[PDB]
Design an enzyme around this catalytic site. Structure first.
Site, PDB file in Angstrom:
ATOM      1  N   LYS A  51      -9.244   6.055  -6.583  1.00  0.00           N
ATOM      2  CA  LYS A  51      -7.722   5.957  -6.634  1.00  0.00           C
ATOM      3  C   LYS A  51      -7.349   5.500  -8.017  1.00  0.00           C
ATOM      4  O   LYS A  51      -7.767   4.418  -8.416  1.00  0.00           O
ATOM      5  CB  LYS A  51      -7.124   5.069  -5.573  1.00  0.00           C
ATOM      6  CG  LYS A  51      -5.603   5.065  -5.597  1.00  0.00           C
ATOM      7  CD  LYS A  51      -5.013   6.359  -5.152  1.00  0.00           C
ATOM      8  CE  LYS A  51      -3.542   6.514  -5.360  1.00  0.00           C
ATOM      9  NZ  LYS A  51      -3.281   7.027  -6.738  1.00  0.00           N
ATOM     10  N   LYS A  75      -2.025   1.780  -3.061  1.00  0.00           N
ATOM     11  CA  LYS A  75      -1.916   2.723  -1.928  1.00  0.00           C
ATOM     12  C   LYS A  75      -3.138   2.723  -1.052  1.00  0.00           C
ATOM     13  O   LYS A  75      -3.087   3.021   0.130  1.00  0.00           O
ATOM     14  CB  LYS A  75      -1.554   4.083  -2.498  1.00  0.00           C
ATOM     15  CG  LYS A  75      -0.078   4.071  -2.987  1.00  0.00           C
ATOM     16  CD  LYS A  75       0.260   5.183  -3.918  1.00  0.00           C
ATOM     17  CE  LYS A  75       1.766   5.134  -4.310  1.00  0.00           C
ATOM     18  NZ  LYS A  75       2.135   5.956  -5.557  1.00  0.00           N
ATOM     19  N   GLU A  89       8.086   1.512  -4.137  1.00  0.00           N
ATOM     20  CA  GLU A  89       8.098   2.559  -5.180  1.00  0.00           C
ATOM     21  C   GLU A  89       9.528   3.050  -5.421  1.00  0.00           C
ATOM     22  O   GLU A  89      10.362   2.949  -4.521  1.00  0.00           O
ATOM     23  CB  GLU A  89       7.173   3.711  -4.787  1.00  0.00           C
ATOM     24  CG  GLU A  89       5.662   3.412  -4.833  1.00  0.00           C
ATOM     25  CD  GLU A  89       5.098   3.376  -6.241  1.00  0.00           C
ATOM     26  OE1 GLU A  89       5.887   3.320  -7.219  1.00  0.00           O
ATOM     27  OE2 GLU A  89       3.863   3.435  -6.405  1.00  0.00           O
ATOM     28  N   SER A 141      -0.473   2.333  -8.733  1.00  0.00           N
ATOM     29  CA  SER A 141      -0.652   3.022  -7.460  1.00  0.00           C
ATOM     30  C   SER A 141      -2.038   2.745  -6.770  1.00  0.00           C
ATOM     31  O   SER A 141      -2.329   3.276  -5.705  1.00  0.00           O
ATOM     32  CB  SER A 141      -0.505   4.513  -7.660  1.00  0.00           C
ATOM     33  OG  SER A 141       0.854   4.973  -7.789  1.00  0.00           O
ATOM     34  N   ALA A 166      -1.142   4.541 -12.998  1.00  0.00           N
ATOM     35  CA  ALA A 166      -0.668   4.564 -14.383  1.00  0.00           C
ATOM     36  C   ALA A 166       0.737   3.846 -14.341  1.00  0.00           C
ATOM     37  O   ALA A 166       1.337   3.676 -13.270  1.00  0.00           O
ATOM     38  CB  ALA A 166      -0.520   5.970 -14.896  1.00  0.00           C
ATOM     39  N   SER A 178      -0.891  10.444  -4.734  1.00  0.00           N
ATOM     40  CA  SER A 178      -0.110   9.303  -5.227  1.00  0.00           C
ATOM     41  C   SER A 178       1.400   9.433  -4.916  1.00  0.00           C
ATOM     42  O   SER A 178       2.269   8.915  -5.572  1.00  0.00           O
ATOM     43  CB  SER A 178      -0.316   9.014  -6.711  1.00  0.00           C
ATOM     44  OG  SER A 178      -0.476   7.678  -6.949  1.00  0.00           O
TER      45      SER A 178
END
Ligand SMILES: [Ca+2]
Length: 263
Positions: free
Chosen positions: A209, A48, A141, A45, A212, A105
């Site tokens: 930021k 982003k 995503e 992530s 995982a 996130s």
């Protein structure tokens, strides 16, 4: 207490897999310390931030507005959408969407923003257009997250991510207001407490930021420094181990303590 490079190499020794690390001076752009700087790691992530960079680029160009309200339906929701699932009737603005994607996130917020620019391959083009021919986004995503090895899909290197982050935060690629907006969202990050934040002394600035993923993946990109002002960029990625989340988190917090004690 160990020196930072020692602790990084110790973290890899303890976890297995690979750990990648870079520390850059924000003002000069000089590499201060590195480990596996040119090797690829999954972004998770952490992309982003780069996504909202591309949004703000469109705002500076007059092609987007942060107050534009986007409505969506329950069918748009994907796994892990804690802010967007609360706004099915009222929708969210483009600016709220970036805040949700960065600070929580939120995966639906990211997908919605990726729709605005035409998809992953358009984010990659924005990166190419700013001089980063390494970082790539290929997926939507939530299917970044998943079984990683490798490919080169959805990957960056520490030095590429760091350089690209520095260009966004301090270059003239974005206007001053857009650069400050991006850094404000990172500063308000709500989901990275067990990582660098856990080591930070009283009064330091941090804008970050985290990410995982599967196969032991974890990472963080951050701008931080003493006395209310960022002065260094730090990128940490790890992948490829069978380590638990608690183990990954702890190693990043220990790398963080080292970096601070040896500043
Ligand atoms: Ca090693």
């Amino acid at each position: 207490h160990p020196e930072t490079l020692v602790k990084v190499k110790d973290a890899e020794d303890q976890l297995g897999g690979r750990v990648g690390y870079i520390e850059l001076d924000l003002a000069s752009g000089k590499i201060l310390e590195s480990f596996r700087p040119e090797e690829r790691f999954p972004m998770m992530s952490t992309f982003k931030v780069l996504l909202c960079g591309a949004v703000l680029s469109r705002v500076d160009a007059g092609q987007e507005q942060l107050g534009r309200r986007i409505h969506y339906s329950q069918n748009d929701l994907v796994e892990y959408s804690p802010v967007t699932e609360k706004h099915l009737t009222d929708g969210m603005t483009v600016g709220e969407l970036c805040s949700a994607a960065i600070t929580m996130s939120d995966n639906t917020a990211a997908n919605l923003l990726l729709t605005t620019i035409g998809g992953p391959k358009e984010l990659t083009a924005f990166l190419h257009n700013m001089g980063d021919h390494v970082t790539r986004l290929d997926s939507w995503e939530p299917e970044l997250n998943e079984a990683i090895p490798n490919d080169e899909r959805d990957t960056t290197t520490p030095v590429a991510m760091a350089t690209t982050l520095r260009k966004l935060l301090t270059g003239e690629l974005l206007t001053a207001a857009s650069r400050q907006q991006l850094i404000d969202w990172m500063e308000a990050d709500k989901v990275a407490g067990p990582l660098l934040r856990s080591a930070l002394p009283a009064g330091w600035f941090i804008a970050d930021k985290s990410g995982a993923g599967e196969r032991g993946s974890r990472g963080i990109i951050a701008a931080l420094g003493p006395d209310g002002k960022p002065s260094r960029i730090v990128v940490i990625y790890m992948t490829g181990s069978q380590a638990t989340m608690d183990e990954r988190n702890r190693q990043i917090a220990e790398i963080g303590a080292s970096l601070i004690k040896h500043w």
